[PDB]
C-alpha cells in the first residue's frame, strides 16, 4: 500500500480513519507504525507504536494467571470480543493520526 498527498491541506482524524480502515481490509494480528516523534526542534527519535488485533493476539498477551483485562467491567451493548474489535480500530486510528501529525511536525 502507498498513501500519499496527506499533508496537502491538513491531517484530520477522519482522514486517518480512512487510512486505518484500509488496514482492516487486510486482517493482521499486529500493526507496526514507524514514525518520528517530534520531541523538540532538534531531536526526533523514531518510534514503533504497536497495535494488536482484538482477540487475534491482544487478549492473549494480557492473559496473566487469569487476565489483566478481567479487572474491567465491560459496559458495551455486545460482548468483550466485539467491543475490543471496536476499540483496537480506534486504537489504530488514534496512533495513525498521531504518527502522521508527529511526523509532519518532525
Amino acid at each position: 500500500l502507498a498513501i500519499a498527498d496527506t499533508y496537502k491541506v491538513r491531517v484530520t482524524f477522519g482522514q486517518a480513519s480512512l487510512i486505518v480502515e484500509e488496514l482492516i481490509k487486510h486482517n493482521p494480528q499486529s500493526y507496526q507504525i514507524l514514525f518520528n516523534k517530534f520531541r523538540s526542534a532538534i531531536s526526533f527519535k523514531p518510534t514503533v507504536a504497536t497495535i494488536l488485533s482484538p482477540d487475534l493476539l491482544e487478549k492473549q498477551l494480557e492473559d496473566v494467571t487469569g487476565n489483566s483485562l478481567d479487572a474491567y467491567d465491560i459496559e458495551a451493548s455486545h460482548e468483550r470480543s466485539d467491543v475490543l474489535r471496536d476499540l483496537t480500530e480506534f486504537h489504530l486510528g488514534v496512533t495513525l493520526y498521531n504518527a502522521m501529525l508527529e511526523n509532519n511536525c518532525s
Partner: protein, 177 residues
C-alpha cells in the same frame, strides 16, 4: 498462555542482536506517559484525575470528583475508587463536576475507561460544549433523518446513528439549568 514475553524493555535487548549497532533503540509510546493503570495511588480521597480527551483537543486533564458519563446502558457517574470499567458511550452529555461548578460537553460517542488506580480516561471524537450547539437546525436534520428509510443496511445504520444522536441532543437542550 503468555509465551511471548513482549514489552518495551524486552524489545531493547532483542533489537540489539538483529539491527546494526550504529542505531539507538526506537522509542515507544510507554516512554511518554507516567500515568499507568495498575500503578497504585492516584486518588487521594474525593477528587480523581479525569483525562477527557479528543483527537484535536485535550479538554480537561485536571481532577474532578464526579463525572457523569453517557453509557450505552444509560447515564452513570464515576466516583473516586470506582470499579475498573471500559464503557462504550452513546451520543450524550459528559458532565464534569469538581464541586459547585459543572461543565457540560455533548460528545459524539467514544469509550471511557476507568482504570484500577482510579483515573478516568474519556476518549471521544467530537466533544462540543452545549454553548455552541444550535437548537434550530438539529430538528431540521432530525426530521430529515426520520424520513430517508432505505433498504440499504449501510445507510440504515448511518440513519440510525443520525436519529439517536439528534434525539439525545434535543433532549439535552430542552432541560438545561
Amino acid at each position: 498462555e503468555a509465551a511471548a514475553p513482549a514489552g518495551p524493555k524486552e524489545f531493547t535487548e532483542v533489537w540489539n542482536k538483529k539491527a546494526p549497532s550504529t542505531l539507538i533503540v526506537p522509542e515507544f509510546p510507554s516512554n511518554y506517559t507516567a500515568v499507568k493503570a495498575v500503578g497504585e495511588g492516584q486518588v487521594h480521597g474525593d477528587a480523581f484525575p479525569v483525562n477527557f480527551y479528543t483527537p484535536h483537543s485535550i479538554l480537561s486533564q485536571a481532577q474532578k470528583d464526579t463525572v457523569v458519563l453517557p453509557g450505552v446502558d444509560g447515564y452513570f457517574g464515576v466516583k473516586a475508587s470506582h470499579v475498573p470499567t471500559i464503557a462504550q458511550l452513546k451520543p450524550g452529555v459528559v458532565e464534569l463536576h469538581s464541586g459547585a461548578e459543572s461543565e457540560k460537553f455533548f460528545v459524539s460517542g467514544g469509550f471511557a475507561f476507568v482504570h484500577p488506580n482510579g483515573v478516568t480516561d474519556i476518549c471521544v471524537l467530537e466533544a462540543a460544549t452545549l454553548d455552541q450547539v444550535d437548537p434550530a437546525a438539529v430538528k431540521s436534520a432530525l426530521a430529515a433523518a426520520s424520513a430517508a428509510q432505505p433498504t440499504d443496511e449501510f445507510e440504515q445504520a448511518a440513519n440510525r446513528a443520525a436519529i439517536e444522536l439528534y434525539s439525545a441532543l434535543e433532549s439535552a437542550v430542552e432541560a438545561k439549568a
